Each structure stands twice: as C-alpha cells, then as structure tokens.
Amino acid sequence: STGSATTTPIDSLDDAYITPVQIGTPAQTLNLDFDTGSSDLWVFSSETTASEVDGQTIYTPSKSTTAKLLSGATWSISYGDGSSSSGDVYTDTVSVGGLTVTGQAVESAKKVSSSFTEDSTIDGLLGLAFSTLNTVSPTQQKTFFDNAKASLDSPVFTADLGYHAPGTYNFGFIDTTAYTGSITYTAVSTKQGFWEWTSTGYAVGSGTFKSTSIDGIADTGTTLLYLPATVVSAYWAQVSGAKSSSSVGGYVFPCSATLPSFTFGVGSARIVIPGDYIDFGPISTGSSSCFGGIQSSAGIGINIFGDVALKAAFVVFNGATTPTLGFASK
C-alpha cells in the first residue's frame, strides 16, 4: 500500500504545516501537524477542557463506531518550545492520503497548553519519530508509520515541504518526479528516538564550504534551523545590522536586508537554503526588525534541522531495519 497527502503552511511565514487526517468511522477529518521529532498522535477532542479549545476541529470518539477506549492508558508530552498536552487514549481507524491503519492509538487531549489553544489551525500532532519516544503509559504505543510499515510497498515516508506553498507527505514510495538529481543517503542514530544524522558542513552565501561534522535531527515539527553558535554567528555576520537580541530571543536583522543563502552538507552532496527562506518577518506588527530563521541551538542541547532546512530538500525517512535519511535537491 501507499498514501499521499498534501501538507499546507498554516500562515504566510510557514510557521508549521498541517495535513488532513481521517479518524474514525464515519471519518472525522482533522488537520494535524506531522512531526518527525515526536512520536504521539494526539488530537483536540470532545474531552478537551472547553476553555482550552478556540476554533480547532475536535475528534469525538463517541461518534466513531470503530473507536475503543484503551483502558487505563494515559499520555503526557512536553515539547522543546515549552508547550504540552495530556489525556487518555482510544484506538481507532486512521487514514492519511488513502493509507489506512486500524487500531491506531489516538491520544485524546484533556488538557493542552496555551500555545496550542491559541493556534486555531492545528487540531493535533501526528508523530513520526521512533516509537520508543511515545509517551503512552503503562503500555507504549506505536506511531502511524510504525503501524503501517509492514503493509507499505517500501518502508519509507517522504517529506516535501513547500516554501510559502503546499507540499506533500508520501508513505510507501519515493516519487522520482519530485526531486532533481540523485538522493544522497546518510546514516541515522536512533539512540535518542529521533531521525538523528550528521551533516558534513556548511557554507554561507557564495562562501567556501567548511567541512565539519554537525550532529542533529530532521524535525518537521520545528519551524527554524537551530545550529551551533559558531555556525550561526558566521551566518549572521554576513548580514549588515544583524544581532542577537536577548529581549527578542534570538538573531534579528533589518527587514531591509537581502539575506544570503545557507548550504548544508549531506555526505558529499549539498542542499542550498535560499536566503528568502531565512526571513521570518517583523518581530512585531509594523516593526522594521525581522526575525531570523537560523538560530543558535546552544540552549537546546541538540541541533535541529527544522522546516527552514527541510523545505529546501526532498527528504526520505527510510524505516528499513537499519534506518537512514535521504536528501535531494528539488
């Protein structure tokens, strides 16, 4: 089997992407944030504290003839941005782009933190990291990909995120029309539960490529590119007037600037992030200070190849017995 679904930016900045997901019988369609950096499929629901729902579409398990309470199971997750959610668990039928999994754990939120409430466009998350990170207790649950894997034509999914435009998540096949050149594959460590890999270096603009190992995660659920402070300083040094602002929370730059590109290495191959992809617009409405899309990971503990990086590539998440990642230009 295969599946193919379009993923759409939630706003004009590509702050996140939502993909329609069918849950239950009859189908209830929710728009979920596909997140290769976490491993829980959780939704706003009829159980979510009413004051914490503000425009989201909710899953109502009592209206699904295939929903079943997973008795005793609870979940609770915290994300790197400080947001969180928790609740109980149902199993139900879940379909993405024509690919159906029966008995998928659907984690129903009883509580969500303010940032989830405040984003009316995201009805939940669909985790695509390794199932060892799944938070359901006392019986850990599998991701949608893990459940579907054996049925897929090939044990892969691909992320093809658009810049200021829709893109595609495919399951079970590699669309050879969706990328240019060849796909370069690179080794993955699953020891932390992430799609963790080592970039071979970087370049700023037309500058020379610096060969240096950068360990980090391919994370579709993180907006920006978070890299070591040395790398990030070298980037922003090429933008007149750019500075790190403690009050804003990162590098800002004059909105009048033209940003240089940023290249990262995948083996001997190179992925070029155009400068425009690094502009996240005014820090506040009407400001002439703009927020940068490349930020330091120094306070995180891990480097994160988020959407800014991944949207410059066609990315293969290869879930074979030894997982690997593939990157192609497009």
Q: Which fold has domain 5-174?
A: Cathepsin D, subunit A; domain 1 (2.40.70)
Is-catalytic flag, 199?
Answer: yes
The answer to whether 71 and 56 are in contact (CB under 8 A) is no
Residue 322, C-beta contacts closer than 8 angstroms, at least 6 positions apart = none
Resolution, in Å, please? 1.2
Phi, psi of 148 (to 5 degrees): -80, -20
**CATH number of the 175-330 domain:** 2.40.70.10
Query: Kind and range of the H or E element at 42?
Result: strand 41-43
The ranges assigned to domains in the chain are: 5-174, 175-330
5-174 and 175-330 agree in CATH topology: yes
Phi, psi of 146 (to 5 degrees): -60, -40
Which among 35, 92, 119, 146 is annotated as catalytic?
35
What are the DSSP E strand ranges found in 164-278?
Answer: 167-171, 184-187, 196-204, 210-218, 225-227, 243-245, 250-254, 262-266, 269-273
Which among 86, 95, 108, 199 is annotated as catalytic?
199
Length of the chain: 330
CA nearest 38: which of 321, 228, 226, 306?
306
Q: Which residue has the tokens 């702050």?
A: 15
Is-catalytic flag, 35?
Answer: yes
The one-character DSSP state at 246 is: T
- Residue 305's Cβ-count burial label (10 Å; 0-12, 13-18, 19+) is buried
